Amino acid sequence: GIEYRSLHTSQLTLSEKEALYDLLIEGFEGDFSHDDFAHTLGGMHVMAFDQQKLVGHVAIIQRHMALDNTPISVGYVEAMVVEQSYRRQGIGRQLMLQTNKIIASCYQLGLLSASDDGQKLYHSVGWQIWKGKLFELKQGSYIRSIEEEGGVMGWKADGEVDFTASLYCDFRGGDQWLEHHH
């Protein structure tokens, strides 16, 4: 069947990294830059394989944030993709359940960014919309990230996380702006 392996970036072979880049480009329909690839590296990769062949991926990146004024360790989930011909068979769900187990063993909180349609998969494995305010650094000072509110979901490993509290994010750059649409 499908076999799942969880590997840190440092544990990947060159072959596996090239196959990951291929899966990401194709699965994101060519909207996937060198910075987006760099942005996926440095943490854990949960990967699905059909015999030797990479067919699914999600990354978990460690981030260090503040919940109101208290430090909180975050596992930040990104770059979820399943090869188009392998979709709608539960691989995405399995990737997320493995991801939840990593978060539970390692971090206080899981966070991710999803579109409205995108959210159902995550919600089926326990994720919930973050209700509180979000803040990001802009030219060295915190400013509320209205854009992103409602698009961020979380998953509670540390039972004392208030999803209505304010999160103050670490800097990850990647053009941040508030959309205004008439």
Ligand X SMILES: CC(C)(COP(=O)(O)OP(=O)(O)OC[C@H]1O[C@@H](n2cnc3c(N)ncnc32)[C@H](O)[C@@H]1OP(=O)(O)O)[C@@H](O)C(=O)NCCC(=O)NCCS
Q: Are 76 and 112 in contact (CB under 8 A)?
A: yes
Among 174, 180, 181, 182, indicate the residue that binds a second copy (CB under 8 A): 174
Binding flag, residue 70, ligand X (CB under 6 A): no
Site map for ligand X, 22-61, x if CB under 6 A? Answer: -----xx---------------------------------
Among 121, 129, 137, 165, indicate the residue that binds ligand X (CB under 6 A): 121
Residue 9 per-residue DSSP state = G
If one counts every other C-beta atom within 10 angstroms of the C-beta of residue 30, the result is 8
Binding flag, residue 10, a second copy (CB under 8 A): yes
Q: Which residues of 52-87 are buried (b: 16+ CB within 10 A; e: fewer)?
A: eebbbbbbbbebebbbeeeebebbbbebbbbbeeee
Dist CA 93 CA 121 (whole Å): 7
Dist CA 163 CA 144 (whole Å): 16
Binding flag, residue 90, ligand X (CB under 6 A): yes
- Residues that bind a second copy (rule: CB under 8 A) add up to a total of 37
Binding flag, residue 82, ligand X (CB under 6 A): yes
The entry of a second copy, ligand X, none near residue 114 (CB within 5 to 8 angstroms by kind) is ligand X
Give the chain's largest Cα–Cα span: 50
Amino acid of residue 23: L
Among 139, 175, 181, 182, indicate the residue that binds a second copy (CB under 8 A): 139
How many C-alpha atoms does 41 have within 13 Å on its Cβ side?
16
87 is in an annotated binding site: yes
Among 44, 77, 91, 152, indicate the residue that binds a second copy (CB under 8 A): 44
Among 14, 34, 120, 141, indicate the residue that binds ligand X (CB under 6 A): 120
